[PDB]
From TrEMBL, chain A:
A GO molecular-function annotation: dynein intermediate chain binding
Family: Belongs to the dynein light chain family.
Presence of keyword Nucleus: yes
Pfam families named in the record: Dynein_light
Gene Ontology BP terms: microtubule-based process; mRNA transport; protein transport
Keywords, sorted A to Z: Cytoplasm, Cytoskeleton, Dynein, Microtubule, Motor protein, mRNA transport, Nucleus, Protein transport, Transport
UniProt protein name: Dynein light chain
InterPro entries: DLC_sf, Dynein_light_chain_typ-1/2
Location in or out of the cell: Cytoplasm, Cytoskeleton; Nucleus
Main localization (coarse): cytoplasm
Organism for this UniProt entry: Tetrahymena thermophila
GO cellular component, one term: cytoplasmic dynein complex
Length: 91, 49
């Protein structure tokens, strides 16, 4: 019932709805699978890189400010608990 | 008989042409590496301390 409890919410989303739904499942799976936050960032980048070819930069922290140059429609912003799963593919 | 060496002079003229050459050039951007950095208040304070 932990998956129901997390209720991850995407504050800002710039991606197709079908792709966005897939990201939520990966984000929930990554948090339980990874013992530490640093492991979560590596797991999200590896899964997305395998799923979609390109260069992916992912940063997750309790408090942070980010300005980035990402390919249009490849940036999805979702916040679960105190962790921000942010991925932006840059060509 | 009307044509004469002084009467008609023939000169052969050609234009210098550089020899055609075939060369292959390959360019490949600088190697890029993946870097993961985790920052915490205690770690920032420890370096500062």
């Amino acid at each position: 019932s932990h998956l129901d409890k997390v209720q991850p919410v995407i504050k800002n989303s710039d991606m197709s709805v079908e792709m966005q739904k897939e990201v939520e499942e990966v984000a929930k799976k990554a948090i339980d699978y990874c013992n530490t936050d640093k492991e979560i960032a590596t797991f999200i980048k590896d899964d997305f890189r395998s799923r979609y070819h390109g260069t992916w930069h992912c940063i997750v922290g309790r408090n942070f400010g980010s300005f980035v140059t990402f390919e249009r429609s490849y940036y999805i912003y979702l916040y679960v608990g105190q962790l921000a799963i942010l991925l932006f593919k840059t060509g | 008989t009307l044509r004469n060496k002084f009467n008609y002079n023939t000169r052969e003229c050609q234009t210098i042409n550089p020899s055609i050459r075939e060369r292959g050039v390959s360019t490949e951007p600088p190697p890029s590496d993946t870097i993961c950095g985790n920052i915490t208040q205690w770690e920032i304070f420890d370096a500062y301390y």
